[PDB]
Amino acid sequence: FKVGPPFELVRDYCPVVESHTGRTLDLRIIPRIDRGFDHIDEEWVGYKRSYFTLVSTFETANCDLDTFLKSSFDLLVEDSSVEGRLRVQYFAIKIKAKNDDDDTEINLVQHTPSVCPLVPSPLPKHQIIREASNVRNITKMKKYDSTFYLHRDHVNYEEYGVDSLLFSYPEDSIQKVARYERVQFASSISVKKPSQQNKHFSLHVILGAVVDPDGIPYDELALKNGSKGMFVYLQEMKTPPLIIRG
């Protein structure tokens, strides 16, 4: 494990507002790469046969988790789409790899990326990510449970309303930290141009809202009840240019 390529803001997309208070939700993705890249003379270098670890959470400025989970949020589209407000079923994160030059998407292979549902939370320290990674100790894993998950089936249900965000999440076990362990680039990718000069890649992290089937950037998504949902972009961050040794 080691300090990896830093993340920078790429863009903020659709604004999110609470349906009851009209309060705008201020969001901030907090991603970090914990291994897989070396910093050689002002350049980040990765390797084909190697793999990398990327973790991420997101935060909501001045909004405590309890209130957040009890709230209802609407996405605000505008102009062309101008639909108005789309109800958020839940928030999730996804990562992608791109050709930092022509912005072409590079496929990633993970060891089990995917759309990870997530609730606001600070990003755990580097060492904790380790002690929680591949260390399946029953007692130990229970010391990190409150750090990595929110078990909806344990909250006081009488405190939440029918439209509460908590109850629109797909599963009872909800992650607090999106952990992408053992990720590699597809072995089919070309890491050099015909001239033999290195190609440049970039890792992206996108925070988004999953909304019901019914011009804005989003990905089509296979929901939980067989329905076709939409993963609408809220915020995106990326690493600086990366090079991949073959």
UniProtKB/Swiss-Prot annotation:
Role summary: Transcription factor required for successful completion of meiosis and spore formation. Gets activated after completion of meiotic recombination at the end of prophase I. Recognizes and binds to the middle sporulation element (MSE) 5'-C[AG]CAAA[AT]-3' in the promoter region of stage-specific genes that are required for progression through meiosis and sporulation. Competes for binding to MSE with the transcriptional repressor SUM1, which represses middle sporulation-specific genes during mitosis and early sporulation.
Effect of residue 111 to A: Reduces DNA-binding by 80% and strongly reduces progress through meiosis and sporulation
Subcellular location: Nucleus
Phenotype upon changing residue 182 to A: Reduces DNA-binding by 93% and abolishes sporulation
Parent sequence residues shown: 63 to 325 of 627
Site (Interaction with DNA): 49, 136, 182
DNA-binding region: 1-246
Induction: Induced during prophase I of meiosis. Requires protein kinase IME2 for initial expression and continued transcription during meiotic divisions. Can autoactivate its own synthesis.
Organism this protein belongs to: Saccharomyces cerevisiae (strain ATCC 204508 / S288c) (Baker's yeast)
PTM: Phosphorylated by pachytene checkpoint kinase IME2, but also phosphorylated in an IME2-independent manner. Phosphorylation probably eliminates SUM1-mediated repression and is also required for full transcriptional activation activity. Phosphorylation of the DNA-binding domain by IME2 does not alter DNA binding affinity.
Protein name: Meiosis-specific transcription factor NDT80
